[PDB]
Design a protein. Structure first.
Lengths: 270, 270
């Protein structure tokens, strides 16, 4: 189809940020063009997920549905971080897709995701993949999540806050925290449950967030929303090159199916 | 200002291509955010312009107006390619801005711009700058042209064709030419008068267009619109990471001031 210059791709939502990063909604991309571009580079995507304690029960539906909807036709390597490696379900994968189990050994728990993704992103990952994506396990894919998301650095608009003014955002507001964001600053509220980028940019974001959380621990402070607060401070200073709409992170029981969402792609399990 | 997710930046035009490249119009960017990002990398922009035979008369207004509107506050190096090096006017430049004169020595004339930018982009340029931009001299800046344009590779929508269907585009249509584009292919018609990118991507585009034009010369064919036809074939296969709207390349005597143009930034001299 010919793009039409004098017809907006969307009339109801912002599709580009003020620093010229695309905000990814249905209707803004031609997946066949993008699929070609990324297949020409033999793109490999690493997906990291933590499944700790009773959350290992969510892995079966998470993986089954990732096989139906996540990066189908591209190279995918899943990295499952778990305290129960023997409890990872044996899900059959499509060609070009592999899964590795990485065993994990309260503020240390809070720092775990950034610390562990940082250590891992400098090892295995760094050889094994082009992009890394971090998501939570208590979720299911219901629709396409593909190479439209890939870029050097991305965050995802939090589904509770996309229509909120910045004063309402639940940033860390105590100047004593490394995650501090003043009341007059901030572009969006990004959710900790879906972020990613190139392996280099994920190394940088996770090192910065881990090192920031350690400084806060030394000072006796825990940011209001833990590594999400540090994610938002990082993405305020280092602006993402794409932003995913809440199509990519939704809770239907909580929030229904608003008119602005043409697809619910990755959703909370109720 | 807080971006508002539920308000389109523009209701009247497409602001992102189907491969998720921004189309740059007024209202789509916050120049203060972009200026900061680019100043943090001490960005240097090379501007190339050819002024041959009687076209040297256009250099005075071109440079005077570039000093008022082009990349003010960033590092700029102008490279003036001319057969009359002694006829380049002595225009006073702002701080951080320099100008070099490069002397140039009918199908060879047609290949000149791509051949010469290719040779130059592998030398001087390659040390001296982060991005190269190629424009024509018979033009004036009337409004801001800044770092919003910078990206690995960009083309500019031709002001005569932005509202046209692809069949009407004046691509090279003879299969015998390296510039050939079939009747059912094509995203936009880009104009030869304003393109650019990182030095690496400009090296690649100019080498590819020069080598394509030489193959056509060997075969006794000249593409319908010369290096513009090769530019459009190149940008069809190697999609630009930003596209400039016709704000950036306009002819007011020919085309007036349509409602969709909030600014006329770089215009033909009548
Ligand atoms: C009854 C719970 C409704 C909470 C809505 C706000 O979501 C929470 O927002 C904070 C930041 O203010 C954190 O991001 C937190 O993780 C969010 O809660 C989780 O996500 C929402 C959408 C919903 O799925 C909750 O059940 C989750 O606990
Ligand atoms: C009376 C001239 C009107 C021509 C309009 C179309 O512009 C020309 O388009 C071809 C491709 O079809 C080339 O891009 C050519 O360089 C264009 O002409 C130049 O640009 C237009 C906008 C106008 O400024 C002309 O005077 C130029 O010759």
């Amino acid at each position: 189809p010919q793009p039409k210059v004098l017809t907006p791709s969307r009339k109801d939502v912002l599709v580009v940020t003020p620093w010229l990063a695309p905000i990814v909604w249905e209707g803004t991309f031609n997946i066949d063009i993008l699929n070609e571009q990324f297949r020409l580079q033999n793109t490999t995507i690493g997906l990291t997920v933590f499944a700790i304690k009773k959350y290992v029960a969510f892995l079966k539906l998470f993986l089954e549905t990732a096989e139906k909807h996540f990066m189908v036709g591209h190279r995918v390597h899943y990295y499952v971080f778990t305290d129960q490696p023997a409890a990872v379900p044996r899900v059959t994968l499509g060609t070009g897709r592999q899964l590795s189990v990485l065993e994990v050994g309260w503020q240390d728990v809070s720092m775990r995701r950034m610390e562990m993704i940082s250590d891992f992103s400098e090892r295995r990952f760094l050889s094994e993949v082009d992009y890394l994506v971090s998501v939570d396990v208590d979720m299911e894919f219901r629709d396409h999540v593909g190479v439209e998301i890939l870029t050097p650095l991305f965050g995802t608009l939090h589904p509770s806050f996309y229509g909120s003014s910045r004063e309402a955002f639940t940033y860390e507001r105590r100047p004593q925290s490394q995650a501090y964001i003043p009341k007059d600053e901030g572009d969006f509220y990004y959710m900790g449950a879906f972020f990613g980028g190139s392996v280099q940019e994920v190394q940088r974001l996770t090192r910065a967030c881990h090192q920031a959380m350690m400084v806060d621990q030394a000072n006796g402070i825990e940011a209001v929303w833990h590594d999400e607060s540090h994610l938002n401070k990082y993405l305020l200073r280092h602006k993402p090159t794409k932003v995913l709409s809440p199509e990519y992170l939704w809770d239907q029981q909580l929030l229904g199916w608003p008119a602005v969402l043409r697809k619910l792609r990755f959703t909370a399990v109720p």
